[PDB]
């Protein structure tokens, strides 16, 4: 029933006194977000997770770079099994 949530502070956001907690997986994610804001008391807050993204081959390399590029570079990964 329990999943352990690590709350990792990025990009100048404050570090929390308790970085991890166990939470029942049936609650809505809002619970987690509201809980952050309660502890931070910060107007702005972004909450995001890493993810993979498989672009359509018909997509122009520029539009990709605009979205997932920096410094005139994009890092594209490839695999043969997954």
């Amino acid at each position: 029933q329990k999943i352990v949530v690590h709350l990792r502070a990025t990009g100048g956001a404050p570090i929390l006194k308790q970085s991890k907690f166990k939470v029942s997986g049936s609650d809505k994610f809002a619970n987690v977000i509201d809980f952050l804001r309660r502890q931070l008391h910060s107007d702005s807050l972004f909450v995001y997770v890493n993810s993979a993204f498989s672009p359509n081959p018909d997509e122009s390399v520029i539009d990709l770079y605009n979205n997932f590029g920096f410094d005139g570079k994009l890092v594209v990964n490839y695999a043969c099994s997954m």
């Binding site: 308790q18 907690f21 166990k22 939470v23 609650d27 987690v32």
Partner: peptide, 5 residues
């Protein structure tokens, strides 16, 4: 062992 809520 930490427990949220």
């Amino acid at each position: 062992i930490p427990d949220m809520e």
